[PDB]
Design a protein around this ligand. Structure first.
Ligand SMILES: CCCCCCCCCCCCCCCCCC(=O)OC[C@H](COP(=O)([O-])OCC[N+](C)(C)C)OC(=O)CCCCCCCCCCCCCCCCC
Ligand SMILES: CCCCCCCCCCCCCCCCCC(=O)OC[C@H](COP(=O)([O-])OCC[N+](C)(C)C)OC(=O)CCCCCCCCCCCCCCCCC
Ligand SMILES: Nc1ncnc2c1ncn2[C@@H]1O[C@H](COP(=O)(O)O)[C@@H](O)[C@H]1O
Lengths: 50, 101, 69, 55, 320, 53, 120, 347, 98, 459, 140, 49
């Protein structure tokens, strides 16, 4: 491919979104524990949100 | 006896003589055409009209329309049971320990 | 647009709750740090601010040439 | 009157001229060592007697 | 590189390598004294070698491809335009003289490095102790002003105090009329404009102030023009001299080690050439300086160091 | 940066002289040997501030 | 101020208690930043000696990256060891002295008095 | 200078500094200080110039006065205390005499009357050795006796040092006097925080040493000792101008550079003790230091001064000098902010 | 404390005021420096001899020793001035001011 | 916020690894991709801010400023790509790298959850603007423009940082998601007075306040126009972000203390409008108009009513866009005539009709023509200041005359009248210039249809 | 010099005039002796008479500064009857600034000195009122 | 043959680059071995296996 310099920023954005999606995993201290948004975990499910 | 020997100051370079079709980007015509196409595609055709379509159909900014609907419910409650529309007490006046006077 | 891009309100809500919890814990620990440092420097009974002194292993307990020592 | 002189005078120019005068007076030393050690002596005499730093 | 304090600690003494052959020779005189082969004569039968005289483009020949560089990159001066109109307003004469002086400094540094590295005597031509006399002629025609001579004295005073005079110095005495006739029969059209006062003042400052300082710190043999073609008498004068004059005897291994450490770093030698004394003849404009520097950057073999240019045919740069 | 290498290498350089109540040649006591012993042994390891207080 | 803890046993970079702590992972962002620092240092050597900046001397760049990563890993180990020592001494002293640090009863907002200043 | 004799001299001065570092005896402290003196003295006389002799005479006289004051403080402490352990002192007057001795040894104001001439009269490597290696042993001694240090005396000396260093640096064209007054300002910034948290003093000392060594290495690389030659460096190399700009921006105190790392946290260890106006005054004098730094940066890098025709010869030879660890020290002097908590290794 | 202690420390500060106020000669200041060290040595030796501290008896003489190890250096810092200037006056020693 | 910082730090090698003739095209294309990507920040709720992580958050306030910043970078790249054609390629990449670093520090400034982080990168922004101002200018006074710009701003904030550190010793955390619930009222004392002064004066200088505005005209009549646009349009907004993030902690002492600040701002905005009425340079006139607009924003946030906050944010964004495009107009004129005099080049409508149309649209949007967002913000601030007190409207009314009077006059002598005879190098419209002008103008008109995205954090 | 400042602050402000004025005059005299001793130390006087003239000049100037400052503070606090108000000290600072301008024979120096040591006197007064510390003792 | 002389850095010194490569490999191997020793000593010292 002779257009390697034009796929730098989309690769960076993909990496940044992957890093952010890994970042909310460490912030699961109060998942399905808030006094206003709590609900029973449905069958065929494991988490309320990824 | 001339001090600090320097080249004469260059004149204002003009762009419409060597290239009458130039769009003010560079000297190479292909570079000018590619730069013009890139900015006119990714600035107008890509950010303006698609950004306008995105912000026109943005999903209910700050739940503002939702702020109507629940309110459309709420008065529909309290106009059917004789309750006042809104009360001067934001919270329950029986659930507050008044300080001594 | 909400399905493809936007974060769910539940996810952002619980993320805010976790952030609030972590930063509140850090603030309380910082306040305890300041109070503990103040008390330790004022009293000197803690492992911090243990300023050096003369070791007692250098004292010679052998009998000397003079009985008065 | 206001924008070009007086506001230009009160904050920046007075500070600049004050630092000008102070830095001129500080580093106009002659390089003599007798004066330097006399300065050390009067410094020691001020610190010991006037300030009373051994209290 | 190749030499340093560790080598001197390891045992590299320069006085081991200088035998009785290691005599530094320079031959200097008038414009067309006939010494141009004579110094080379001392090269070809004494087991020595003789670099040519430090010209405008000697540094362009000793570094890079060896092809002399254009005027814009190196020098920005012209000897021929100096010969046509030496009273030009831009001070081309002083620029040419200063470039020649820096060339002589680099030439003497290279010769001293060769002497201290191989122990071989080197024959030179018009060494750095014998260039100012030309500028004295430049002062006695009205060609340059007082401030430029002051700048030259400052430069020479700050760059010559770290060096040593040569072993012997050979002078060829030619009369002004004979060398003038020689110049007129040279045939080059750009050197038909030398005045007689030029050579007269050259010889006057040559015999007046240069001899009573060079005769003490080194050995000088005053030859003559007709006997300058006699190589055997000159070489017999060379072999049967007593080496007792000058500072060449009270120089131990550490002093020559310091000399070699100073010499082999060329920017240390050329550091004091461009002192920040502001002169209208020498100062180059900032825009012109940037343009000339960018032009010299794109020349082949000059964008990077001497062995890191892919455009000249260097391999294994990624492993170097 | 009091790099106490005297305890790291276990070599005694100047701990044998630094205190009046140390080991002396031919076992000669100083004029205040007992007071030095009391002041060291009372104020050992508890910190300078507590030792002064 | 931790010198008392470094009083009995000196000149120890990593004492015996430092081995009981979780070491930093190789994918730590600080280690990546220090590796970037080493790469920038190699680029500066390629720049200041008039060499090509991105191809000349890959061995020098790899040596710089490795040395920077090594010293950064050991310095980060010492850093987290010292911070763990700080927090452990903190909790030990806060178990040890409860008389000088009592408890607080967090009151509700239904009875604590606050003064409201109107903005107008 | 003989390389073996020079190596022996360097081993002597490092041995004296190590002796001051590791000894638990006052006499050995003074012996290490005397060895430090006697080994740094011939370093300044490597070139055998009258300026070097004047600087050596001034340095020797000032450090001898400091050494005799240190001995009198030691003898007073001995007579009132009966021992020799390097710990808190048992007399305020001994604390006075030792503080004056260490201030004279460091060059802190008003005893700053010897640092600029001594730095100016000696070459760049000797100035590096002075302004870096002579600021380690007195800092260790002040680290050892900080229980007995009077607060008002050290704070007054610190604020006088910063103010005098800034006002001195405002009016000097020579590079070495600029370095000396900047060193006085950094000394005051470093010794103002000594009584509150000596780890901040050690951190600021380490950062100041790294930055000053970086700058002296750049000056040695460019072989420049004047402002005009420093401006003339733009034609020889642009990279040298980039590094001098970023380094002299770093010592100014600007974020996100490393020089903002110590000084800011100095305030972080002085607002905890409820000292508010003193870090503000020292920040104002740091702005003065930044002002003369900004003038110097305007001279060297941001404006290209006119050059001469000789420098074209210097375009044909690369820099063959030995830059000792220049990129590492430049990187550590510029981009150490995101590794700020690493100061916890100094506990 | 005592009386001879007062006399010795007053001699030290008298010699200090002698050194700290120059009189246009370097070697006279060197003599005052060696006088300050004489007071230091005398005070230390008397303090030890009063307190019966035997093992510290090395410290005075060694102190004395080290002083000579710098004092000759001061003499070695004199003739070099005499190798540049004709005399050794301190008011001539003002070249380092620019 | 890692999905926009990593694109910037990854575009940094892209402008370092680009070819010798495709730097501008690649940088403009990829910055426009980042500009489209930045629209995802508008996932806003009426109660909770979009808190991305521990040290990054963005409510309804900072999101329009971020969108303006990374929409502003390509406009700067086009506006600064003419005069740098003769500049060396390495220095061209240095200039583009400086602009990229300035954008990165700006986006990290507006989303910093901790106030210490916000301060640290808010004056990490100081280095690239200083470098650009001092190096790539066109006059001698740029050297002086590097002093008055710097030694003002730092002198306002080296107290402020100490005050911030004091809050770290008082509250225990400077996080903004915590301090909305841990905030205590400020009592009336001299110590709280000086804390208020220290927390206020840095952004008072950065607005600038009148009396402290001397750094603004001296740093605008000489800058390269990339620097001029970033200074006028987005760099002055750091003061507004400082107000709307700091004024939570400074209640209720702000109400009975900000009287002389409001007096200074009102009478100085009157003075600077009058100074605009008698100017000779385009750049100085636009800079003094910016001083007037920021004094109005100062009053708007100092009276602290919700309507005032809406008007302050709307006026900030609209003034940033308008001042950037006005500086583009002045740069086109200075490009064509090689001077900054207003009276020199007159009657350009006879020669350049489309630039005359852009001049007319700029002048109309400058004097708050409805229904543009400039009029929306200015009207909301007008009503809020009338709610603060009645007599203020008089102190507004004269200004609203004067802010029209120069705004057309600056047009008229530059566009209407007999053209100068001895000027003949007036080239026609380059497509790059008019494309930049339309890219400035069209969002300013488009935001009038849907203003609710730029109406602050409390719409 | 630790007793001059305390004796200055041992008397209630605006109550008695001459003792406060003489205390401020003594503080000014000590400062003048210090600065004149430094001035004759670093800068060599041409003669003994010129040196003692310079010493007397600095002593007189600083004594007048202190005396007028203390006096103006005393009558300001007596007239306004407000002991806990720093505006009296600001007025005294401008009085000292006018004194400095008179003894140095300048006017812009007088106005700058008005502003500068008026602000300094105010900072001293709220430092006394709010209990600020120039040299804070170590706590943590 | 471009340059008139032989530059000292015009030829790849194989010993120097070999020593650099060996030192880098040794440092990396020591780093991973130390990391492994630390991680299993951590799991041993707390029993969290
Ligand atoms: C944002 C802060 C930073 C600023 C710089 C931003 C840079 C990036 C810019 C990206 C692109 C632009 C984004 C913003 C776009 C705003 C516009 C938009 O989309 O609005 C959505 C709004 C959405 O409308 P809405 O909000 O009413 O719709 C509700 C939403 N739904 C449909 C889901 C229920 O669009 C309109 O209002 C369009 C209305 C119709 C079109 C216009 C018709 C009339 C035209 C004029 C006729 C003549 C009149 C008389 C003239 C007289 C002479 C003057
Ligand atoms: C642009 C140039 C001008 C800039 C002006 C900036 C604003 C002016 C005021 C800034 C003061 C410095 C920061 C103070 C922060 C205090 C925070 C706090 O909580 O304070 C309470 C503390 C209170 O003390 P405390 O909190 O330690 O005491 C405990 C609490 N009580 C009181 C109950 C016992 O205030 C102070 O300690 C003093 C504050 C005033 C400081 C006065 C000295 C500085 C004067 C201004 C200098 C400005 C720069 C001039 C030069 C510019 C460059 C040329
Ligand atoms: N410094 C100088 N000034 C003027 N002319 C010089 C200088 N150095 C060398 N030359 C000329 O160089 C030539 C020497 O070459 P040759 O004729 O081979 O001896 C003569 O024409 C000299 O006049």
């Amino acid at each position: 491919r002779d257009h390697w310099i034009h796929v730098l920023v989309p690769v960076g954005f993909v990496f940044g979104y992957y890093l952010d999606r890994k970042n909310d995993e460490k912030l699961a201290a109060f998942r399905n524990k808030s006094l206003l948004y709590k609900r029973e975990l449905k069958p065929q499910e494991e988490v309320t949100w990824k | 006896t001339l001090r600090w020997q320097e080249d004469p100051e260059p004149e204002d370079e003009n762009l419409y003589e060597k290239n009458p079709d130039s769009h003010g980007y560079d000297k190479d015509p292909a570079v000018d055409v590619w730069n013009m196409r890139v900015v006119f595609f990714f600035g107008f055709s890509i950010v303006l009209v698609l950004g306008s379509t995105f912000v026109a159909y943005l999903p209910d900014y700050r739940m503002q329309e939702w702020a109507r609907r629940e309110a459309e419910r709420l008065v529909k409650y309290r106009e059917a049971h004789g309750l006042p529309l809104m009360e001067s007490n934001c919270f329950d006046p029986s659930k507050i320990q008044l300080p001594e006077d | 647009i909400a399905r493809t891009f936007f974060d769910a309100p539940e996810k952002n809500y619980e993320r805010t709750m976790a952030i609030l919890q972590i930063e509140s814990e850090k603030a309380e620990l910082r306040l305890k740090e300041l109070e503990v440092r103040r008390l330790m420097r004022a009293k000197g009974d803690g492992p911090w601010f243990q300023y050096p002194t003369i070791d007692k292993a250098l004292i010679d307990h052998s009998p000397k040439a003079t009985p008065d020592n | 009157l206001l924008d070009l002189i007086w506001l230009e005078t009160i904050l920046p120019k007075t500070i600049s001229l004050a630092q000008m005068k102070m830095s001129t007076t500080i580093t106009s030393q002659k390089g003599l060592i007798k004066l330097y050690f006399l300065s050390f002596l009067i410094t020691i005499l001020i610190s010991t007697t006037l300030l009373n730093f051994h209290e | 590189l190749q030499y340093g304090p560790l080598a001197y600690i390891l045992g590299e003494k320069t006085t081991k390598k200088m035998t009785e052959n290691s005599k530094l020779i320079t031959v200097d005189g008038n414009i067309c004294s006939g010494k141009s082969k004579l110094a080379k004569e001392v090269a070809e039968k004494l087991g020595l070698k003789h670099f040519p005289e430090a010209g405008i483009h000697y540094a362009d020949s000793t570094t890079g491809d060896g092809k002399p560089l254009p005027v814009r990159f190196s020098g920005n001066c012209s000897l021929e335009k100096f010969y046509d109109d030496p009273k030009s307003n831009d001070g081309n004469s002083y620029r040419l003289q200063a470039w020649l002086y820096a060339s002589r400094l680099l030439q003497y540094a290279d010769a001293l490095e060769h002497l201290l590295s191989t122990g071989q005597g080197v024959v030179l031509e018009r060494s750095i102790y014998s260039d100012f006399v030309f500028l004295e002629a430049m002062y006695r025609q009205g060609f340059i002003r007082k401030q430029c001579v002051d700048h030259y004295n400052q430069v020479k005073k700050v760059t010559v105090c770290e060096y040593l005079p040569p072993h012997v110095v050979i002078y060829v005495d030619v009369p002004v009329s004979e060398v003038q006739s020689r110049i007129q029969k040279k045939g080059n059209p750009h050197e038909m404009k030398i005045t007689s006062a030029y050579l007269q003042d050259i010889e006057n400052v040559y015999k007046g102030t240069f001899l009573p300082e060079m005769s003490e710190k080194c050995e000088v043999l005053q030859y003559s023009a007709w006997e300058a073609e006699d190589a055997e008498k000159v070489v017999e004068d060379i072999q049967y001299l007593k080496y007792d004059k000058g500072p060449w005897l009270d120089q131990d291994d550490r002093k020559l080690h310091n000399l070699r450490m100073l010499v082999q770093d060329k920017l240390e030698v050329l550091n004091y050439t461009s002192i920040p004394v502001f002169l209208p003849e020498v100062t180059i404009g900032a825009h012109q300086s940037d343009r000339v520097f960018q032009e010299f950057t794109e020349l082949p073999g000059r964008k990077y160091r001497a062995g890191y240019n892919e455009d000249v045919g260097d391999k294994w740069i990624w492993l170097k | 940066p009091f790099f106490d290498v005297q305890k790291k290498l276990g070599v005694d350089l100047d701990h044998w002289m630094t205190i009046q109540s140390a080991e002396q040649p031919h076992r000669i006591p100083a004029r205040c040997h007992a007071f030095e012993k009391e002041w060291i042994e009372c104020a050992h390891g508890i910190g300078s501030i507590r030792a002064e207080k | 101020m931790m010198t008392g803890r470094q009083a009995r046993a000196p000149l120890q970079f990593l004492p015996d208690e430092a081995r009981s702590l979780p070491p930093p992972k190789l994918t730590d962002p600080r280690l990546a930043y220090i590796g970037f620092l080493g790469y920038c240092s190699g680029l500066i050597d390629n720049a200041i000696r008039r060499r090509p900046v991105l191809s000349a001397g890959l061995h020098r760049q790899f040596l710089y990256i490795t040395s920077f990563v090594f010293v950064g890993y050991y310095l980060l180990k010492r850093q987290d060891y010292m911070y763990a020592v700080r927090d452990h001494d903190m909790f030990s002293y806060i178990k040890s002295h409860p008389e000088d640090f009592p408890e607080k009863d967090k009151k509700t907002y239904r009875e604590v008095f606050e003064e409201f200043h109107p903005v107008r | 200078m003989n390389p073996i004799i020079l190596i022996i001299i360097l081993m002597t001065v490092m041995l004296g500094t190590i002796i001051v570092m590791i000894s638990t005896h006052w006499l050995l402290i003074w012996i290490g200080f005397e060895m430090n003196m006697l080994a740094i003295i011939p370093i300044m006389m490597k070139k055998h110039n009258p300026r070097a002799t004047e600087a050596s005479t001034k340095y020797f006289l000032t450090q001898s006065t400091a050494s005799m004051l240190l001995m009198m403080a030691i003898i007073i402490n001995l007579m009132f205390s009966g021992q020799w352990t390097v710990m808190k002192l048992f007399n305020p007057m001994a604390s006075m005499l030792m503080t004056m001795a260490l201030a004279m040894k460091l060059g802190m104001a008003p005893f700053h009357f010897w640092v600029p001439e001594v730095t100016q009269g000696i070459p760049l490597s000797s100035g590096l050795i002075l302004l870096t290696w002579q600021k380690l042993a007195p800092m260790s001694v002040l680290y050892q006796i900080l229980p007995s240090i009077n607060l008002d005396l050290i704070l007054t000396l610190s604020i006088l040092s910063i103010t005098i260093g800034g006002w001195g640096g405002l009016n000097q064209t020579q590079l070495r006097k600029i370095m000396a007054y900047s060193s006085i300002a950094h000394m005051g910034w470093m010794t103002a925080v000594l009584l509150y948290n000596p780890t901040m003093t050690l951190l600021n000392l380490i950062i100041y040493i790294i930055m000053t060594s970086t700058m002296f290495t750049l000056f040695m690389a460019n072989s420049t000792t004047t402002t005009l030659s420093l401006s003339h460096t733009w034609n020889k190399a642009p990279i040298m101008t980039i590094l001098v700009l970023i380094t002299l921006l770093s010592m100014g105190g600007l974020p996100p550079l490393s020089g903002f790392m110590p000084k800011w946290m100095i305030i972080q260890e002085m607002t905890k003790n409820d000292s508010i106006i003193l870090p503000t005054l020292m920040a104002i004098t740091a702005l003065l230091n930044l002002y003369f730094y900004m003038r110097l940066t305007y001279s060297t890098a941001l404006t290209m001064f006119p050059s001469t025709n000789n420098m074209k010869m210097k375009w044909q030879f690369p820099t063959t000098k030995r830059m000792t660890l220049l990129p590492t020290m430049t990187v550590l002097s510029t981009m150490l902010l995101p590794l700020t908590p690493i100061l916890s290794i100094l506990e | 404390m005592s009386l001879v202690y007062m006399n010795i420390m007053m001699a030290f500060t008298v010699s200090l005021t002698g050194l700290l106020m120059y009189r246009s000669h370097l070697m006279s200041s060197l003599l005052c420096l060696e006088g300050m060290m004489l007071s230091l040595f005398i005070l230390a030796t008397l303090m030890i001899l009063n307190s019966h501290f035997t093992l510290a008896s090395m410290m005075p003489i060694i102190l004395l020793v080290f002083a000579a190890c710098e004092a000759a250096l001061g003499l070695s810092l004199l003739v070099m001035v005499s190798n540049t200037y004709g005399t050794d006056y301190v008011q001539n020693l003002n070249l380092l001011q620019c | 916020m890692l999905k926009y910082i990593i694109p910037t730090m990854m575009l940094m090698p892209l402008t370092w690894l680009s070819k010798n003739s495709m730097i501008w095209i690649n940088t403009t294309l990829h910055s426009l991709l980042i500009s489209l990507t930045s629209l995802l920040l508008l996932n806003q709720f009426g109660d909770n801010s979009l808190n991305f992580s521990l040290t990054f958050f963005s409510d309804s306030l900072s999101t329009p400023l971020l969108i303006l910043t990374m929409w502003l970078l390509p406009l700067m790249l086009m506006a600064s790509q003419h005069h740098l054609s003769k500049e060396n390629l390495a220095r061209k990449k240095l200039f583009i790298s400086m602009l990229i670093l300035l954008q990165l520090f700006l986006i990290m400034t507006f989303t910093a959850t901790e106030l210490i982080f916000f301060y640290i990168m808010f004056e990490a922004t100081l280095v690239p603007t200083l470098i650009i101002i001092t190096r790539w200018g066109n006059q001698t006074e740029r050297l002086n423009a590097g002093l008055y710009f710097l030694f003002y701003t730092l002198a306002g904030s080296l107290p402020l940082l100490v005050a911030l550190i004091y809050i770290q010793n008082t509250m225990g955390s400077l996080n903004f998601l915590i301090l909305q619930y841990w905030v205590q009222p400020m009592p009336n004392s001299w110590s709280n007075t000086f804390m208020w002064l220290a927390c206020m004066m840095a952004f008072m200088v950065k607005m600038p306040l009148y009396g402290l505005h001397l750094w603004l005209p001296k740093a605008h009549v000489e800058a390269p126009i990339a620097g001029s646009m970033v200074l006028a349009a987005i760099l002055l907004k750091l003061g507004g972000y400082g107000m709307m993030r700091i004024t939570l902690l400074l209640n209720p002492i702000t109400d009975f203390m900000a009287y002389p600040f409001i007096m200074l701002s009102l009478w100085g905005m009157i003075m600077t409008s009058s100074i605009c009425l008698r100017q000779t340079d385009l750049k100085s006139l636009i800079a003094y108009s910016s001083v007037s607009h920021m004094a109005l924003v100062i009053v708007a946030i100092l009276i602290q009513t919700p309507w005032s906050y809406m008007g302050a944010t709307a006026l900030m964004i609209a003034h940033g866009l308008t001042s950037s495009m006005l500086f583009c107009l002045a740069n086109s004129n200075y490009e064509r005539v090689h001077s900054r005099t207003m009276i020199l080049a007159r009657g350009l409508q006879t020669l350049l009709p489309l630039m005359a149309a852009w001049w007319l649209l700029a002048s109309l949007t400058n004097l708050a023509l409805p229904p543009s967002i400039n009029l929306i913000g200015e009207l909301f601030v007008v009503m809020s200041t009338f709610s603060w007190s009645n007599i203020t409207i008089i102190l507004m009314g004269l200004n609203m005359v004067i802010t029209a009077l120069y705004s057309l006059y600056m047009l008229i002598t530059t566009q209407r009248g007999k053209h100068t005879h001895h000027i003949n190098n007036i080239l026609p419209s380059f497509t790059r210039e008019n494309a930049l002008m339309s890219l400035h103008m069209l969002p300013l008109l488009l935001l009038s249809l849907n203003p609710k995205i730029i109406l602050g954090p409390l719409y | 010099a630790k007793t001059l400042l305390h004796q200055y602050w041992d008397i209630p402000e605006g109550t008695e005039c001459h003792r406060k004025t003489y205390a401020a005059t003594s503080i000014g005299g000590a400062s003048g002796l210090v600065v004149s001793a430094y001035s004759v130390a670093l800068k060599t006087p041409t003669s003994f008479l010129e040196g003692v003239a310079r010493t007397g000049r600095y002593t007189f100037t600083a004594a007048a500064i202190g005396a007028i400052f203390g006096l103006t503070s005393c009558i300001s606090a007596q007239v306004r009857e407000k002991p806990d108000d720093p505006l009296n000290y600001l007025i005294g600072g401008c009085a000292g600034g006018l004194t400095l301008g008179a003894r140095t024979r300048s006017y812009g120096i007088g106005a700058a000195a008005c502003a500068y040591m008026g602000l300094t006197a105010a900072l001293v007064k709220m430092g006394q009122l709010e209990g600020w510390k120039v040299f804070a003792e170590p706590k943590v | 043959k471009f340059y008139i002389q032989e530059p000292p850095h015009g030829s790849p010194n194989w010993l120097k680059v070999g020593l650099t490569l060996g030192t880098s490999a040794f440092l990396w191997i020591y780093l991973i071995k130390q990391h492994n020793e630390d991680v299993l000593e951590y799991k041993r010292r707390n029993g969290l296996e």
